[PDB]
Amino acid sequence: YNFSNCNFTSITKIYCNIIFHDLTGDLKGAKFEQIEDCESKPACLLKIEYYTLNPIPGCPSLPDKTFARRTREALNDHCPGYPQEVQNICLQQTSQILRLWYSFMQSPE
Amino acid sequence: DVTVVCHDLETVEVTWGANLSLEFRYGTGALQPCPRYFLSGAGVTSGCILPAARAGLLELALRDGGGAMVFKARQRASAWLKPRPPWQVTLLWTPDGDVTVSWPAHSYLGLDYEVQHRESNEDAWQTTSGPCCDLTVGGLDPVRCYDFRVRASPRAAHYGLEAQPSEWTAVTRLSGAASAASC
Amino acid sequence: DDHSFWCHSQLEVDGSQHLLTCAFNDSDINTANLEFQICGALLRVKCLTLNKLQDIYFIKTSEFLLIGSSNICVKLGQKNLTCKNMAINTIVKAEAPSDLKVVYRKEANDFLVTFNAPHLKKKYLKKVKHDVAYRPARGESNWTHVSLFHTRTTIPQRKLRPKAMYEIKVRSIPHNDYFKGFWSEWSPSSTFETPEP
Numbered sequence A: 001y002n003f004s005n006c007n008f009t010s011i012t013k014i015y016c017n018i019i020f021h022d023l024t025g026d027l028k029g030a031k032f033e034q035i036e037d038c039e040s041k042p043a044c045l046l047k048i049e050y051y052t053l054n055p056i057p058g059c060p061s062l063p064d065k066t067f068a069r070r071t072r073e074a075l076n077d078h079c080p081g082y083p084q085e086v087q088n089i090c091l092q093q094t095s096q097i098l099r100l101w102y103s104f105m106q107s108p109e
Numbered sequence B: 001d002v003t004v005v006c007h008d009l010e011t012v013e014v015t016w017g018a019n020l021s022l023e024f025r026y027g028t029g030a031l032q033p034c035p036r037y038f039l040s041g042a043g044v045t046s047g048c049i050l051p052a053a054r055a056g057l058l059e060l061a062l063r064d065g066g067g068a069m070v071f072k073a074r075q076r077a078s079a080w081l082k083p084r085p086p087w088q089v090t091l092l093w094t095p096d097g098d099v100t101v102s103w104p105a106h107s108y109l110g111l112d113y114e115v116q117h118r119e120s121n122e123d124a125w126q127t128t129s130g131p132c133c134d135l136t137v138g139g140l141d142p143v144r145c146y147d148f149r150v151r152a153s154p155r156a157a158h159y160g161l162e163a164q165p166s167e168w169t170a171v172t173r174l175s176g177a178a179s180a181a182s183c
Numbered sequence C: 001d002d003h004s005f006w007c008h009s010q011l012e013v014d015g016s017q018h019l020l021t022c023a024f025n026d027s028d029i030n031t032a033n034l035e036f037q038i039c040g041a042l043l044r045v046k047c048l049t050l051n052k053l054q055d056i057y058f059i060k061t062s063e064f065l066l067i068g069s070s071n072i073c074v075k076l077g078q079k080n081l082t083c084k085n086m087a088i089n090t091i092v093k094a095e096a097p098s099d100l101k102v103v104y105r106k107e108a109n110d111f112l113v114t115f116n117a118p119h120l121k122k123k124y125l126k127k128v129k130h131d132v133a134y135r136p137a138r139g140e141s142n143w144t145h146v147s148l149f150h151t152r153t154t155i156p157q158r159k160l161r162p163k164a165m166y167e168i169k170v171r172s173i174p175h176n177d178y179f180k181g182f183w184s185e186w187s188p189s190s191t192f193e194t195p196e197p
């Protein structure tokens, strides 16, 4: 999908006022070295979506967490045409996602 | 305990304190040596200043003599942002009895500004906040002298939780109906 | 034959769950067999039905997305009498402040007013605008209001009558570019006494 048509202003308000708090809330201060970066709002949203809604080995439940469902709903609402478990892995992925949001916030449209 | 501060998205300053050495890179290119160490008289390092890039991941590797890792990090440089203070603050009495506080913008987004004031006569500071580049402070007495100061504060959702506010500006003193020599 | 109604939400009420409360504008209404149902913008389910308690309907839930709008419908059996579309995030009623206290400071010739602001400790919506109101405890007066974004303010002594008793109370409203809504209930009132001039 091409995230270039998303309303970034709306998504930003949702991230700043809800999703950000959900992420920091889940991380409880844990952080990990950052693996990837991104340099535009559309490119960051693409990575965010991919990290957030695709399960990974060690944290199958990730796409079902509240911050993930809210991310899905925010993209759905504001992007036209948008379609066991180890806690340390969950945290690692959650930390990556939060930092991709920071990149989103710092990137141009 | 190692500290990292990114000064105004211009430089990154890493401070420690054996003789440590620092390598760094942006992205996945080749590690590079610290471009400028802070050295003691005996020639042991105390820190490093390097350039900040607004994008890309800054990897830091601090090693002991012998090549052992003592500190590692990998985040955007802005993760450690401390903005410069605002350059010059202006205070303007409006006819309403309000004061408009204004300042020049920083060269990057995502900052809130905190404006404090109190009577120039060790009382508590009152604070108000807002985005660039002005805000209004109401209810001031036209004949009393007030101190104002401002700082820039990186928004947590924008830059994250390791960013920190600038230093306060030097005080700017206001006199509603009085001359400056009344303050 | 008017089933017009209001709703307000409250975030993080007795834990992580949020509260939705609705009621009819007209209290003289036969609510016989009427139900409130909310559909849309929920996490795991299509709809929820509110629970009736005397003259109000409420649901405490974890299901709200807080993103996008919901349809709230007054139903009689399967008949929709009236449905309104609204977003939970734009009908938020703040929690009232508490621990209101007033201390006379002679050296400052003023009264220091302090209270506790519960939103500061919450997950979402941490910043509210406060409204402090005061007037003499006896007799009729227009309340004096003070608008604040922090949990203290001062009243100069000279502003008040001497040797009198004042009543004071405080309320809050969301102040957020996403969450919007309504004034809290007033805090309980405190009273304080003013000195000789």
Ligand SMILES: *[C@@H]1O[C@H](CO)[C@@H](O)[C@H](O)[C@H]1NC(C)=O
Residues within 6 Å of the ligand: B019, B020, B021, B022, B037, B042, B043, B044, B045
């Ligand atoms: C300490 O390490 C720095 C960085 O590698 C180097 O420039 C300096 O010569 C060293 N000093 C001593 C006394 O080994």
